[PDB]
Amino acid sequence: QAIDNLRASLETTNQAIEAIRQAGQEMILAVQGVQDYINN
Amino acid sequence: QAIDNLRASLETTNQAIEAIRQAGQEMILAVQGVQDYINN
């Protein structure tokens, strides 16, 4: 069960990382949006 | 002990992720600060 517990923790951690990765893609679009507006 | 070693590693990894997550919150404030200044 201790092995299963670690596996469930690491699954959860990977989901957290994926949420940060998607936040990063939104921040690239935000910086792109600022750069677009000052170059309009 | 190998199970305990993995657990300590994953604890450490989670702390690293939390540092990146907080860096992300500071980058949102930075992009907000740029957007605020060009809209002043």
Partner: peptide
């Protein structure tokens, strides 16, 4: 730009929730 930063903030909050869940599983 504000919509993109809102969506980013939402995803960072979901990441925090998931990290606390990971930590709680490890405690067990």
């Amino acid at each position: 730009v504000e919509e993109n930063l809102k969506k980013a903030e939402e995803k960072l909050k979901k990441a925090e929730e998931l990290l606390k869940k990971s930590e709680e599983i490890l405690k067990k």
